[PDB]
Structure 1
Amino acid sequence: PLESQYQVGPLLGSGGFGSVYSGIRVSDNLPVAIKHVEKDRISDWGELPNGTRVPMEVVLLKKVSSGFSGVIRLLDWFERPDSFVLILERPEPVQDLFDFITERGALQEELARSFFWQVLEAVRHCHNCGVLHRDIKDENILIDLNRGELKLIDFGSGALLKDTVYTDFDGTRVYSPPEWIRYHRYHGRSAAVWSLGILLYDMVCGDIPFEHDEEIIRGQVFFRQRVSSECQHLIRWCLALRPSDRPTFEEIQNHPWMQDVLLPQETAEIHLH
């Protein structure tokens, strides 16, 4: 049982998704996180390669939890009467990027360069694993503060990766690409590039670039902060209106602004310790 094996601590979070508690694995005092989700409110189910019929979040988690990555891993899970319970990695100490930016404002370019890279590597990882995240934002990124290592969370909005069009999107409005606003159609990769464009803006500007639909389809970014002529390029390109004009992950990662990335410890040394 879940109540036997894991010492429940405080509650870290609540919402549309569910409820998430800090927790300790008794069997060796390993930090964990315990996410509970009512079956009642589960929007999108799936079946795992054992047959068993679980929520989609669980399948995806299994797929990406091969080897090491910047993806919060699944360690375990339990079904109950009216809920499923998920044991995830908990790093210690840890703060999510939405809090981090809210607290500390616009990030220095060197720091944003590290974090973005890290996110790109992680998203690449997911795509190799057949998984599309679909809600890529500050709130879904945790920063292990000692290692300076970014880790990806929440696959509630996620899906299997595919090359044909997508026609639902239970992720956030402001981060929604204009092809979805206008047509209720998009493709995973290109739209992922769109949300990464919004993410990079947030990092370097302290706030997201578009508040309303009209601004999004406008497709026009005013920098409120001093940003390098090079970063502005890469942001504007990720936020190109026609998706086919947006870069690929490779093109992002060879863009001049993404040169000389600090590694995670170095990043923490300078910017977090």
Structure 2
Amino acid sequence: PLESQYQVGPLLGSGGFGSVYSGIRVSDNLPVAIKHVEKDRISDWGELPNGTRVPMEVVLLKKVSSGFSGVIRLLDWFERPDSFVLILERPEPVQDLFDFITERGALQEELARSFFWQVLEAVRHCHNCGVLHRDIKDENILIDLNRGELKLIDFGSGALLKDTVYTDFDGTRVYSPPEWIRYHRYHGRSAAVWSLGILLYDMVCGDIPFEHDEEIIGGQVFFRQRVSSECQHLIRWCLALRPSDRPTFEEIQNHPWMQDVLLPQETAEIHLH
């Protein structure tokens, strides 16, 4: 049972993703996060190979949780009469990227480069596992402050990756692409790249570029902070109005701005320790 197997600590947060508590695995004192969601609040369902009816979140997490990666891994899950409970990794010490940027302001480009590179590798991992996250944003990125490693959280808005059109979106609006605003249609990979452009801007400017729909569809990116010409170019490319004009993951990682990335360890030593 969950209750004897885990020592439950304080609430870490709650919202659309349910309620998440800090925890410790009793057997070996592993730090964990314990996520509860009411069955009545679960819109998207899937099934395991053996036909157990589970939240799609569990299917997606299982797909991305094999091997080591920049994704918070699903360690176990439990079904209760009225809810599911998910046991996730918890780094320590940790801070989400939203809080990090709020506290420290716009990031030095060396740090933004290391962070952005890691998110790109994590997103490539998800896509290789057949999973689209669909809510990439600063709030869903955890920084392991000692190891300098970034981890993606919250697959609650995600989907199985497909090559055909998506007509549903329950992710974060201001990180949502103009084709969604205009047509309620997007393709996974090019929508992902849009969200990555928003994230990169957020990192080097300290806030997101667009508030209103009209800015999102407008085709203009204004820089409020000093940002290098190469970084501006990459951001503007990721934020191309036409989805087909956006870079692939390969083209992003080959962009001149992305060269000579720091290792996670170096990043921690220079910027986080």
TM-score tier, shorter chain, comes to over 0.9
**2-structure distance, mates of 1:98, 1:27:** 33
Q: Quote how far apart the aligned CAs of 1:16 are.
A: 1.8
Q: Quote how far apart the aligned CAs of 1:111 are.
A: 0.1
Q: Quote how far apart the aligned CAs of 1:27 are.
A: 0.4
- What per-residue deviation string (whole Å, max 9, x for no partner) do you get for residues 145-185 of structure 1? 00000000001100000000000000011111000100001
TM superposition score normalised by structure 2: 0.99
> Secondary structure, in 3 states, of the residue corresponding to 2:40?
coil
- What per-residue deviation string (whole Å, max 9, x for no partner) do you get for residues 86-110 of structure 1? 0000110000000000111100000
Q: Quote how far apart the aligned CAs of 1:81 are.
A: 0.8
> Secondary structure, in 3 states, of the residue corresponding to 1:86?
strand
**2-structure distance, mates of 1:160, 1:55:** 13
Q: Quote how far apart the aligned CAs of 1:264 are.
A: 0.1
**2-structure distance, mates of 1:175, 1:37:** 24
Aligned residue-pair number: 273
Q: Quote how far apart the aligned CAs of 1:43 are.
A: 1.3
**2-structure distance, mates of 1:170, 1:20:** 19
Q: Quote how far apart the aligned CAs of 1:235 are.
A: 0.1
**1-structure distance, mates of 2:43, 2:93:** 32
Moved over 2 A (4+): none
> Secondary structure, in 3 states, of the residue corresponding to 1:118?
helix
> Secondary structure, in 3 states, of the residue corresponding to 1:21?
strand
**1-structure distance, mates of 2:219, 2:157:** 24
> Secondary structure, in 3 states, of the residue corresponding to 1:19?
strand
Q: Quote how far apart the aligned CAs of 1:49 are.
A: 1.1
**2-structure distance, mates of 1:10, 1:66:** 28
For the aligned residues, what is the CA RMSD? 0.5
**1-structure distance, mates of 2:14, 2:68:** 28
**2-structure distance, mates of 1:40, 1:79:** 13
Give 1:158's aligned residue: 158
Q: Quote how far apart the aligned CAs of 1:51 are.
A: 1.1
Q: Quote how far apart the aligned CAs of 1:256 are.
A: 0.1
**2-structure distance, mates of 1:187, 1:219:** 19
Give 2:241's aligned residue: 241
Q: Quote how far apart the aligned CAs of 1:252 are.
A: 0.1
> Secondary structure, in 3 states, of the residue corresponding to 2:36?
strand
Q: Quote how far apart the aligned CAs of 1:17 are.
A: 1.7
**1-structure distance, mates of 2:253, 2:9:** 40
> Secondary structure, in 3 states, of the residue corresponding to 1:95?
strand
Q: Quote how far apart the aligned CAs of 1:63 are.
A: 0.5
Q: Can you give the 5+ residue segments of structure 2 that lack an aligned partner in the other structure?
A: none
**1-structure distance, mates of 2:257, 2:28:** 43
> Secondary structure, in 3 states, of the residue corresponding to 1:27?
coil
- What per-residue deviation string (whole Å, max 9, x for no partner) do you get for residues 100-128 of structure 1? 00111100000000000000000000000
Q: Quote how far apart the aligned CAs of 1:136 are.
A: 0.3
- What per-residue deviation string (whole Å, max 9, x for no partner) do you get for residues 32-62 of structure 1? 0000000011111100112101000000100
**1-structure distance, mates of 2:237, 2:254:** 13
**2-structure distance, mates of 1:263, 1:248:** 23
Q: Quote how far apart the aligned CAs of 1:241 are.
A: 0.2
Q: Quote how far apart the aligned CAs of 1:219 are.
A: 1.9
Q: Quote how far apart the aligned CAs of 1:23 are.
A: 0.2
